[PDB]
Amino acid sequence: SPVAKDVDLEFLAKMTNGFSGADLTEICQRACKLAIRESIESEIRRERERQTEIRRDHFEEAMRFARRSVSDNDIRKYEMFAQTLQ
Amino acid sequence: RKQLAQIKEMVELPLRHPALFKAIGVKPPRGILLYGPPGTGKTLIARAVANETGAFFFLINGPEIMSKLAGESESNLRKAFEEAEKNAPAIIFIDELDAIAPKREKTHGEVERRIVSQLLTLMDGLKQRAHVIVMAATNRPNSIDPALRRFGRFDREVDIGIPDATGRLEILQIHTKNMKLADDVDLEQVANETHGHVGADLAALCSEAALQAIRVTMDDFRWALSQSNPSALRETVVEVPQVTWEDIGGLEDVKRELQELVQYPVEHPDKFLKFGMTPSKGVLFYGPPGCGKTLLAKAIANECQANFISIKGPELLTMWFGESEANVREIFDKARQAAPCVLFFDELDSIAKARAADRVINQILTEMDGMSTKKNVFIIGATNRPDIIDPAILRPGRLDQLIYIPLPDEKSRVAILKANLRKSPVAKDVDLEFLAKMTNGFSGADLTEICQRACKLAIRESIESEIRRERERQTEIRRDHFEEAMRFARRSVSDNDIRKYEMFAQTLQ
Amino acid sequence: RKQLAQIKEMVELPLRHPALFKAIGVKPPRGILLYGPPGTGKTLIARAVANETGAFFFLINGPEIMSKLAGESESNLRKAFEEAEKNAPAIIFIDELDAIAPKREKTHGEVERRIVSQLLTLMDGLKQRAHVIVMAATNRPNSIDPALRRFGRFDREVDIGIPDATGRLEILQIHTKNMKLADDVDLEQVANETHGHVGADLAALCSEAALQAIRVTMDDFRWALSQSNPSALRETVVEVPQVTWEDIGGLEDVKRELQELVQYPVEHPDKFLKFGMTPSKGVLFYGPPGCGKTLLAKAIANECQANFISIKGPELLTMWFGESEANVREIFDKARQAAPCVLFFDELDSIAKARAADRVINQILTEMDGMSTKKNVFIIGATNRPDIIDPAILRPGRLDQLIYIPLPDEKSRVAILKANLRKSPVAKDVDLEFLAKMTNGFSGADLTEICQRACKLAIRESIESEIRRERERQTEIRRDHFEEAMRFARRSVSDNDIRKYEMFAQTLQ
Ligand SMILES: Cc1cc2c(C(N)=O)cccc2n1-c1nc2c(c(NCc3ccccc3)n1)COCC2
Ligand SMILES: Cc1cc2c(C(N)=O)cccc2n1-c1nc2c(c(NCc3ccccc3)n1)COCC2
């Protein structure tokens, strides 16, 4: 993927404490779809105006609706069931 | 001095400017009733008002009247009343009124009923013509026989409650101007630390502070504080709180909502009168338990410079489990009298949760219904369970407006770290936004327990090192501490719950 | 003598050094109220303080006043008060105050209300100017009419409760200095054995001890102990316990936790004041039923040389089932007055378990809320069921800190064997670590019942052999006993349960 270096991924590490892979994934995918959208929308806009990479804008855009998959309850449940499974 | 002002506006003008009222075709008050807890110097106040109006003063020590042989009591009363009547402008002040004139089935004998009757007839007997005012003392007006709070008798009532920081400070200054006060002594400190104290308790405090010096440093004051057992711990404190809105960083929408609900009709009433629509009776704060639902309610009172009253739910529980719903009436009376004011119910869900109960919640209903719209007294209902509150409370003309007081924002997280660390040693390499980001989904409570855990790590390291230095002599707080403290610190409220308020926020609407 | 000290600090300086206070601009106390059970010689104490201050002493035997014809009572009172007023420095001491001045709806007649009124007016009448102090006696201040515990009247209150071992010892020495005391007699033994005894019961004990000699050996004392029925069995014993931390071997983490919670703010307050954070209100001990949750709580009080008060849960149950939640207020007052102190609730789960109940637990709430933070009184809540405690109790500012008090460690097992066998014959071939290892997963209770079973095997073998030697004449404890005793001895608490506290320890956090 095209990813400019002003996508620091540790800004993303910290913010995504308690996140499952799935959420990181859907963050990335939402970003990528915002990018594609902006891209071809702008290209079609440029077709219509001719007939007279991905950056943390996209990402904090994408995180502005992105979950934390698994709730404390559950993880606590594996904790419990990890201890008492042992 | 604020207190005197009222009593002088009620006394002076119809004691020593009487002709204007009797010409303008009205009546002076003939029965000004002072009440509030003991340790308040109501007597002092009465004589103060008599001296500073310029009027004859006659004390009636209730005990003294009640100690006489049946007859000589009534005699003493008549005597007092004629003695005042004759020397008037006259204040007759009745100390411990409740003594002679109680709640009158707690009177296993007819002599007292005669004695009270007498006082009623005497109270009736006066003329505004005769230039006589009767003041009287008691803990609460519930104490006195209601046939004294007739219009003909003790019509006007003044509450001299607990004093607040400033009053306490004034009192301390007044009792300690005559004292060997050290430079390290802080009066304001003590004034702030002296919750539930009254004039008496503060006097006593100053006294033990003296005595233990005489065995005055700050140590002595703090020690005397360690010793003192204030009287008015148990009394419901009414004061305007000193939490600013800008102390509560963020939570903006709620600021503006609360302003539109409670601020606009006290601060721009012209408008509400103009458009004609009349204000919300009150509010309901719901959301997760880790927040300053209290503090917002305070903050809007502070913002409207109006009073504040917390009913902790254990008050409610105590009422339900005891079936003393009566006392709701008394609470609302107490708010009404201390207008303008926010009556803040904490844990409104308690009565309803814990299962004359819906009745305790219901007395609050009948009282919200019966309370006059115009009196500017707002009434904020806290919970965490909109789901359990008798929904009659959420009927319009009651707790009309619902507000989701949600988890703190970053600005607010910062605000709360700041609040929790206000008085503390905090080196600047504790950035609080490192702490803002890490604590997404955290309740106040968690920020708090982070701060406290840190502080305890600091104290621990400190005195452990000091004792280690005692043992080695007998041959500030920094993000080390904090990331130490966060390395066991929760996220209070689980997604489930917040999603539950979300859901119940949407579908409550 | 410790007791007198206080009363002399309250009396002497404003009886016989009065000008300093009245100049420095404060007030002496004019009503020092002594209370506590009968058998305490409050009268003796008053006259002691009057003689050792140098002051006129006037007794008012309540019964004597109440026995007069209505009128001559008030007469007697006025008389007494003027007689004192005239001869002053003056202590007016009122024996059985509750007699003249009771809880005043328990007064089926107006004469008593007049008599009390009189005493109120007389109490009001005094000046610090007149050099007069009024002391007074009763069982508990609940007895007296509250309008006597006004500031104007009996403001200062002193508790002369049960005496502890040392007091009992002093008293025994004092009553038995005049006695044919044998060499085998042990006063301290008896002092330690005399729980619930007061001055009177001890006097009586010494007396029967005499009389049965005169029919004094240790036998006589122990026999008189066998006979005596002390008065204050029923009274809630406040004393600093004498269990060291090092009596409680191991359980270290809890030691240090409890120290950081309860020790650091009484022993290094400078620090808590410095960092600014204010201490835990209290604690909650949970875990398995076989442990010394009591003893830890004692041990931290002992460590902080603070008092201790056990509310056994049967006190709680008695309150709930009777709906005498009132008495919580009285308990906290009793702790507050006996500061610093640990108020230890045992089986806090009882009220809640056994199903104005959440109210009894709730009164404890309102009291924890209303108790002043600064007063150094800690408040430890025992259970075995964190799961059942009204979680409002586990809300911050209440029982903030949870502590899992788990099963004893080997050091602690040893400690408990040692404790259970302290006074016993134990040959050195009872190694206690053989016993430490074998008893992994055991509660104190099991170690205890091991020891007891052993001891009973020993007694059995002993007296069986002695009787066998009587029958054959009419022609220490060793690991034999112990491995005998363990050959039927449980493991109290099952893995399930401990795993349950583990789980509920983790997920409680
Ligand atoms: C010391 C403290 C603990 C605490 C807790 C808690 N769970 O322990 C919850 C809420 C507020 C809390 N505060 C607190 N206390 C204060 C303030 C403040 N922040 C502004 C605010 C309040 C509620 C919301 C947003 C932001 N927060 C404001 O200054 C005075 C006292
Ligand atoms: C007599 C006795 C019975 C008992 C029991 C019991 N269920 O019988 C449980 C725990 C301690 C017990 N003690 C006991 N009592 C004492 C001590 C002590 N050892 C240290 C200890 C205390 C609490 C906890 C751990 C270990 N143990 C210390 O000496 C004074 C009294």
CB distance B90 to B58 below 8 Å = yes
CB contact under 8 A, B214 and C396: no
| Residue C238 placed within a domain | no
Residues of B in contact with C272 (CB under 8 A): 459
Backbone angles phi, psi at A16, to 5 degrees: -105, 35
C354, amino acid identity: A
CB contact under 8 A, C124 and B64: yes
Rounded Cα–Cα distance for residues B38 and B42 (Å):
9
**End-to-end Cα separation, chain B, in angstroms:** 49
Residue nearest to atom 15 of ligand 2 (CA): C419
Rounded Cα–Cα distance for residues C202 and B407 (Å):
63
| Residue B243 placed within a domain | no
Rounded Cα–Cα distance for residues A77 and B24 (Å):
79
Rounded Cα–Cα distance for residues B385 and B241 (Å):
26
In this structure, the answer to whether residues B396 and B426 fall within a common structural domain is no
And the tokens for C232?
Answer: 């204050």
In this structure, the answer to whether residues C111 and C222 fall within a common structural domain is no
Q: Identify the three-state secondary structure at position B167.
A: helix
User: How far apart are the CA of C412 and the centre of ligand 2, in A?
Assistant: 8
C476, amino acid identity: E
Count Cα atoms within 13 angstroms, Cβ side, for C289: 10
**What is the maximum alpha-carbon separation in chain C?**
92
Q: Which residue from C278, C276, C261, C279 is spatially nearest to B425, judged by alpha carbons?
A: C276
Query: Distance of alpha carbon B405 from its chain centroid, rounded?
Result: 24
Rounded Cα–Cα distance for residues C198 and C206 (Å):
12
Ligand nearest to the CA of B291: 1
A45, amino acid identity: R
How far away is chain B from the Cα of A47, in angstroms, using its nearest Cα? 43
Contact of B175 with chain C, judged by CB distance below 8 Å, is answered with yes
Bridge partners of C60, per DSSP, are C94
In this structure, the answer to whether residues B212 and B291 fall within a common structural domain is no
Size of interface B-C (CB pairs under 8 A): 150
CB distance B335 to B369 below 8 Å = no
The number of beta carbons lying within 10 Å of the beta carbon of residue C348 is 28
CB contact under 8 A, A72 and B491: yes
Kindly report the CATH number assigned to the domain that includes residue B320.
Answer: 3.40.50.300
In this structure, the answer to whether residues B122 and B269 fall within a common structural domain is no
Count Cα atoms within 13 angstroms, Cβ side, for C292: 28
Q: Which atom of ligand 1 is nearest to the CA of B445?
A: 7
| Residue C372 placed within a domain | yes
| Residue A86 placed within a domain | no
Among C159, C184, C206, the domain boundary falls at C159
Rounded Cα–Cα distance for residues C156 and B212 (Å):
16
How far away is chain B from the Cα of A24, in angstroms, using its nearest Cα? 17
Residue B19: burial class (beta carbons within 10 Å; 0-12, 13-18, 19+):
exposed
In this structure, the answer to whether residues C214 and C116 fall within a common structural domain is no
Rounded Cα–Cα distance for residues C258 and C284 (Å):
11
Contact of A15 with chain B, judged by CB distance below 8 Å, is answered with yes
Rounded Cα–Cα distance for residues B273 and B204 (Å):
50
The number of beta carbons lying within 10 Å of the beta carbon of residue C391 is 12
Q: Identify the three-state secondary structure at position B445.
A: helix
Q: Which residue from B111, B214, B163 is spatially nearest to C18, judged by alpha carbons?
A: B214
**End-to-end Cα separation, chain A, in angstroms:** 43
Among C404, C424, C446, the domain boundary falls at C404
Rounded Cα–Cα distance for residues B95 and B101 (Å):
11
- Which residues 377-416 on chain C approach chain B with CB closer than 8 angstroms? 392, 396
Q: Which residue from B330, B319, B331 is spatially nearest to C359, judged by alpha carbons?
A: B319
In this structure, the answer to whether residues B387 and B421 fall within a common structural domain is no
Question: Who's near C505: CB < 8 A, 6+ residues apart?
Answer: C404
Rounded Cα–Cα distance for residues B287 and C45 (Å):
59
Kindly report the CATH number assigned to the domain that includes residue C192.
Answer: 1.10.8.60
Map B361-397 to HEC letters: HHHHHHHHHHCCCCCCEEEEEECCCHHHCCHHHHCCC
Rounded Cα–Cα distance for residues C440 and C434 (Å):
11
Backbone Cα Rg of chain B: 27
C388, amino acid identity: I
| Residue C247 placed within a domain | no
CB distance C288 to C493 below 8 Å = yes
Residues of B in contact with C117 (CB under 8 A): 63-67, 99
Number of domains present in the structure of chain C: 4
Rounded Cα–Cα distance for residues C275 and B458 (Å):
8
| Residue C239 placed within a domain | no
Residues of A in contact with B440 (CB under 8 A): 15, 17
CB distance B111 to B70 below 8 Å = yes
Map C353-383 to HEC letters: HHCCHHHHHHHHHHHHHHCCCCCCEEEEEEC
B384, amino acid identity: N
In the block, residue with structure tokens 């009565």: B351
Length of chain A: 86
- Which residues 17-76 on chain A approach chain B with CB closer than 8 angstroms? 17-18, 68, 71-73
**End-to-end Cα separation, chain C, in angstroms:** 49
Rounded Cα–Cα distance for residues B182 and B179 (Å):
9
Map B454-490 to HEC letters: HHHHHHHHHHHHHHHHHHHHCCCECHHHHHHHHCCCC
| Residue B205 placed within a domain | yes
Q: Which residue from B465, B292, B443, B460 is spatially nearest to B380, judged by alpha carbons?
A: B292
In this structure, the answer to whether residues C11 and C145 fall within a common structural domain is yes
CA angle B63, B65, B67 (to 5 degrees): 65
CB contact under 8 A, A79 and C499: no
The number of beta carbons lying within 10 Å of the beta carbon of residue C258 is 29
In the block, residue with structure tokens 């003008």: B13
How far away is chain A from the Cα of C387, in angstroms, using its nearest Cα? 16
Among C385, C404, C423, the domain boundary falls at C404
Q: B156-159 and B31-35 as β-strands: parallel, antiparallel, unpaired? A: parallel
Rounded Cα–Cα distance for residues A84 and B270 (Å):
67
| Residue A83 placed within a domain | no
In this structure, the answer to whether residues C87 and C213 fall within a common structural domain is no
Rounded Cα–Cα distance for residues B247 and B295 (Å):
10
Count Cα atoms within 13 angstroms, Cβ side, for B5: 3
CB distance C482 to C430 below 8 Å = yes
User: How far apart are the CA of C507 and the centre of ligand 2, in A?
Assistant: 28
DSSP class of residue C387 equals G
The number of beta carbons lying within 10 Å of the beta carbon of residue B43 is 17
H or E element at residue C135: strand C132-136
In this structure, the answer to whether residues B274 and B398 fall within a common structural domain is yes
Q: What share of chain A is helix, strand, coil (3-state, %, to 5)?
A: 65, 0, 30
DSSP class of residue B408 equals P
CB contact under 8 A, C26 and B67: no
In this structure, the answer to whether residues C120 and C142 fall within a common structural domain is yes
In this structure, the answer to whether residues C309 and C339 fall within a common structural domain is yes
CB distance C262 to C300 below 8 Å = yes
In this structure, the answer to whether residues C146 and C293 fall within a common structural domain is no
CB distance B294 to B310 below 8 Å = yes
The number of beta carbons lying within 10 Å of the beta carbon of residue B146 is 11
Q: Which atom of ligand 2 is nearest to the CA of C412?
A: 26
Residues of A in contact with C497 (CB under 8 A): none
Residues of A in contact with B486 (CB under 8 A): none
Q: Identify the three-state secondary structure at position C34.
A: strand
CA C65, C70, C74, C79 dihedral sign is negative
Mutate which of A71, A74, A76, A79 to disrupt the B interface (most B C-beta within 10 Å)?
A71
| Residue B410 CB–ligand 1 contact under 6 Å | no
Inter-CA distances, C300 with C163, C273, C331, C373, Å: 22, 21, 20, 19
Q: Identify the three-state secondary structure at position B344.
A: strand
Backbone angles phi, psi at B421, to 5 degrees: -110, 10
Residue B7: which domain range?
1-159
Kindly report the CATH number assigned to the domain that includes residue C456.
Answer: 6.10.20.150
| Residue B439 CB–ligand 1 contact under 6 Å | no
Residue nearest to atom 5 of ligand 2 (CA): C444
Solving technique for this entry?
A: X-ray
